[PDB]
Amino acid sequence: DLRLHLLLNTSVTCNDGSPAGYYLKESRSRRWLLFLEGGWYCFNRENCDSRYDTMRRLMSSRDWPRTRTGTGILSSQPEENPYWWNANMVFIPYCSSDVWSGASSKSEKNEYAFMGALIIQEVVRELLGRGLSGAKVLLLAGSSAGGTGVLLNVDRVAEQLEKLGYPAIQVRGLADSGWFLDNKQYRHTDCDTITCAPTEAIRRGIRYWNGVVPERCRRQFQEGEEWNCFFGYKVYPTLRSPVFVVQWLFDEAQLTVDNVHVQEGLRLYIQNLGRELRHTLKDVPASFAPACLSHEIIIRSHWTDVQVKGTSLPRALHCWDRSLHTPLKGCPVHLVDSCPWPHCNPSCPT
Ligand SMILES: *[C@@H]1O[C@H](CO)[C@@H](O)[C@H](O)[C@H]1NC(C)=O
Numbered sequence: 617d618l619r620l621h622l623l624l625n626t627s628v629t630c631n632d633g634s635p636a637g638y639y640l641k642e643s644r645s646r647r648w649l650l651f652l653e654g655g656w657y658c659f660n661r662e663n664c665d666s667r668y669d670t671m672r673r674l675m676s677s678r679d680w681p682r683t684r685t686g687t688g689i690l691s692s693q694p695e696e697n698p699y700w701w702n703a704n705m706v707f708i709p710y711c712s713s714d715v716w717s718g719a720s721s722k723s724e725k726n727e728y729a730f731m732g733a734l735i736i737q738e739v740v741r742e743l744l745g746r747g748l749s750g751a752k753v754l755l756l757a758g759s760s761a762g763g764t765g766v767l768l769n770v771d772r773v774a775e776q777l778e779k780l781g782y783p784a785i786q787v788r789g790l791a792d793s794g795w796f797l798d799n800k801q802y803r804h805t806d807c808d809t810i811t812c813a814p815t816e817a818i819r820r821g822i823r824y825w826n827g828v829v830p831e832r833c834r835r836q837f838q839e840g841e842e843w844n845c846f847f848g849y850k851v852y853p854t855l856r857s858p859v860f861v862v863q864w865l866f867d868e869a870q871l872t873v874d875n876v877h878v879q880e881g882l883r884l885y886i887q888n889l890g891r892e893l894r895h896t897l898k899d900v901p902a903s904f905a906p907a908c909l910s911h912e913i914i915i916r917s918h919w920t921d922v923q924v925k926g927t928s929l930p931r932a933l934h935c936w937d938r939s940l941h942t943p944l945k946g947c948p949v950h951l952v953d954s955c956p957w958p959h960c961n962p963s964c965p966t
Pocket residue numbers: 625627628734738
């Protein structure tokens with residue numbers, strides 16, 4: 617089990633001012649896995665108020681359990697986790713509703729705190745006194761909103777460790793189901809909560825959260841256009857840390873924001889979405905992109921079952937490790953399906 621620790625710096629908070637935190641299982645290993653939880657976001661008073669009543673664990677630590685069980689890539693059992701079962705394991709709950717980008721406290725002017733970027737920094741700082749100072753590799757992983765969080769924060773963790781005097785820790789990122797397209801939608805609605813497209817919702821969110829993006833991406837798109845850096849294919853080329861990208865070609869969250877819930881028009885729309893996603897990954901050398909309609913994530917216990925070209929994700933991640941010690945005989949790291957319809961890969965989740 618992973619044991620809860622609330623942050624000693626109680627000024628770094630969840631949305632409602634309760635302290636943020638992390639769950640830890642030590643492996644007395646020089647590998648550290650820090651995993652970012654997902655769970656959408658909120659971007660104004662009214663839809664944050666709604667989220668506070670029916671998704672409170674995503675806005676508050678007041679009700680968190682004292683322990684959690686690690687699953688999938690967070691499992692310590694080699695049967696379930698062929699990749700990193702003997703690593704030090706950290707699960708960081710998502711309680712900031714800001715795609716891990718915020719840097720704003722609750723105050724007389726702000727009903728909620730949005731501190732996702734500062735939560736990650738404070739977790740890292742507090743872990744350095746519990747053994748992270750001796751690490752050889754720190755893998756910042758995440759699913760869904762947490763996968764986009766990896767892309768927004770992995771270079772900031774690398775910079776933080778460099779400035780604290782730990783240049784020998786290699787920082788890497790693993791972004792699962794956080795690689796979205798700002799594409800044409802299947803049906804169109806002007807921007808309330810359910811009609812607001814991600815580009816418009818994220819533009820408003822950044823202002824509401826005091827959201828922060830990677831500096832080299834911010835310098836490209838400049839003031840008012842930071843929303844671009846929340847889209848993987850736009851932020852990835854600006855990053856210096858090695859990042860492995862896991863993305864379903866037909867991700868259920870992407871289709872939902874595209875107002876898709878089969879005749880010829882919709883068939884062509886779905887096939888073109890798969891082709892577009894494949895295109896954005898052509899020059900991403902470490903990636904795993906199966907042709908499935910899914911919302912399943914890498915902390916699920918049966919994560920080893922899906923294969924691309926006969927290679928599982930735990931194997932691809934191991935080959936990635938070897939590549940960071942020129943391609944490796946029988947140990948591939950770039951695995952993108954080419955077939956054009958959901959479940960044309962037989963290993964897709966059932
Ligand atoms: C607590 O965290 C805040 C936000 O990062 C920071 O400004 C402050 O210096 C921290 N306090 C201590 C004692 O580390």
